[PDB]
Design a protein around this ligand. Structure first.
Ligand code: NA
Ligand code: NA
Lengths: 268, 268
C-alpha cells in the first residue's frame, strides 16, 4: 500500500445505478472517451459506470513527476471515496496496466476486471517506440496536424478499417472530437508503463479477469496480452479480429458483448 | 512516347552477363538497395542485372519539377542506351508504378515484369498518407532520428518481424546503412504516384507479369496489388505472408524464388 501519496481532485462522472464498473482510460484519454461506445451499453445492462480523468489529463494536464504507483493510488482513492469497493474494473492499454498493478497491491478493491490491449512488459520494438515518443516530445518538435493524424490512423486501426474509404474518412474526422494535446502530463504518462518484467507478480492475482487482445494491434501486440492472461491464474484471453489498438472504438459491439458476458458470468 | 524530355545522366551499375533484368527502386531508394538481397540471387541464376539511381536520388537528389512520365522516359532511355530492349523489369512501389506506366506507353521495351508492392490508384487512406507526408516536408519540420526510425519500422515491416526482438534490433541498425534523406528529389518522388484511376489503361498490357503483394503492407495494401493483377490480362497475383512494405528485404528467399520461377517460366 502507498505511503508517499497525496490525494488530488480528479474529475469524474458517476452514471447509473447498480453494480459499479470503474473505467480506466489509456494514455491521453479523458474519462469521456468511454462515453461514445462503452457507458451507454453498460448502463443498458444495468451497471453503474465511473469514468474519470487520469492524472495528467485535463485539469491536471501539466502534472509531472508521477509514476504508475501514483496512478494506482489515485484509482484506489477514487474507489474508496465513492465507497464502491469491490468494483469491476475495465482498463485499456495504460489503464489496463494501472488495473493490473492495482490488483497486485489492493486486490480487495477489484471484484473482476477486463484488461484490453495490455502487456506485462515491453519487447524490443515497443521499448524503442516509447524511446522514440519520448525523444519527439523532449526535442520540442511539433508534428504538423495531418501528419499527426496519419500516425494516429496507422497506429490505432486495423487493416480492414484502413481499406474502408468511408470508415477512414470518419476516423479522420473523429480526431477533431478526440484531440490528444502534447502536454507535460501526456509525456509523464509515457513512463507509466512496464519498466520491468511484471508477469510473475500477476500470478498472485486470484480475481477473475478477461484479457482482450486486438489482432492488428501494433502498440500492444496481442501476444503480450496473451502473456498476461497466461500469468493470471483465473484470467482468460479473447482476441478480436480486424481490430487495432483502438479496437473498443472500432468494434464496439464485439468488445462490449465480450465484456458484458464476462461480467455476468462472475455475478455474486 | 515522350516529346518533352531531356535525357540526364543517371548513375547505374551493370553486373553479370546474360538475359537483362532492370530493377527500379521505390521512393527514396538508390540502385544499391537491390544489392544486399536481389542482385546476388539473380546473378547466381545467370541474369545480367541493371540497377540505377532514379531521378531525385543521389547526384540528382535536388531535382524537382519532374513527373511519373519523366521517370518513365528516364527508364526507357536507360534501356535504349544499354541496348537491352526488350528487358525484364523488376519494380517495387514507385518503381512498380514506373514499370506499369512504361509498359503502357512502350511495351516493346519490356519482355516481362515483376511488380512488387504496387497499386493502380490511391484509396482514401493512402491519399491521406501522401497528403500528410507532403505536409510534413512542406512544413520544414524535421523528425528526430529515433522517431523517424520508429515510423520506418511501423510502416515497412510485418507484425511477425516487429515481435522478433533480434530482428527488430537488426532493422534499426540497417537504417544506418540505408538512410533516407529528406531532399527536394524525395519530395518530388512523392507525387510520382497514381493521381488517377489507372487500372483501365493496364488492361492493354499483353506481356506476362507477376504482381507480388505483401500481406502486412500498409503503404501499398495487398488488395490494391490484386487490382493491378486483375487488370493485367497476363498478370498473376502472389501474396507473401508475414511481409510488410519492405518484404523484399524481410523475406528475400521467398520473393526471389517467386521472381526467378516466374522469369524462367516465360523464357524465350
Ligand atoms: Na490464465
Ligand atoms: Na490477371
Amino acid at each position: 500500500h502507498h505511503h508517499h501519496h497525496m490525494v488530488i481532485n480528479l474529475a469524474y462522472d458517476d452514471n447509473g445505478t447498480g453494480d459499479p464498473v470503474v473505467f480506466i482510460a489509456g494514455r491521453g484519454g479523458a474519462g469521456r472517451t468511454w462515453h461514445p461506445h462503452q457507458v451507454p451499453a453498460f448502463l443498458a445492462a444495468g451497471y453503474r459506470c465511473i469514468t474519470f480523468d487520469n492524472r495528467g489529463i485535463g485539469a491536471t494536464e501539466n502534472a509531472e513527476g508521477f509514476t504508475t504507483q501514483t496512478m494506482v493510488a489515485d484509482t484506489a482513492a477514487l474507489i474508496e471515496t465513492l465507497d464502491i469497493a469491490p468494483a469491476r474494473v475495465v482498463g485499456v492499454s495504460m489503464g489496463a496496466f494501472i488495473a493490473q498493478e492495482l490488483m497486485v497491491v489492493a486486490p480487495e478493491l477489484v471484484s473482476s476486471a477486463v484488461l484490453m490491449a495490455t502487456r506485462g512488459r515491453l519487447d524490443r520494438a515497443r521499448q524503442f517506440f516509447n524511446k522514440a515518443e519520448a525523444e519527439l516530445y523532449d526535442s520540442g518538435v511539433q508534428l504538423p496536424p495531418t501528419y499527426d493524424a496519419r500516425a494516429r490512423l496507422l497506429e490505432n486501426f486495423s487493416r480492414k478499417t484502413l481499406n474502408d474509404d468511408v470508415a477512414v474518412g470518419d476516423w479522420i474526422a473523429m480526431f477533431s472530437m478526440w484531440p490528444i494535446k502534447s502536454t507535460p502530463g501526456l509525456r509523464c504518462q509515457l513512463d507509466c508503463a512496464p519498466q520491468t518484467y511484471r508477469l510473475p507478480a500477476y500470478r498472485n492475482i486470484a480475481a477473475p479477469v478477461l484479457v482482450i487482445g486486438f489482432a492488428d494491434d501494433v502498440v500492444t501486440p496481442p501476444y503480450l496480452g496473451r502473456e498476461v492472461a497466461d500469468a493470471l491464474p483465473n484470467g482468460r484471453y479473447l482476441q478480436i479480429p480486424d481490430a487495432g489498438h483502438l479496437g473498443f472504438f472500432e468494434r464496439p459491439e464485439a468488445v462490449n458483448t465480450a465484456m458484458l458476458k464476462f461480467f455476468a458470468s462472475v455475478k455474486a
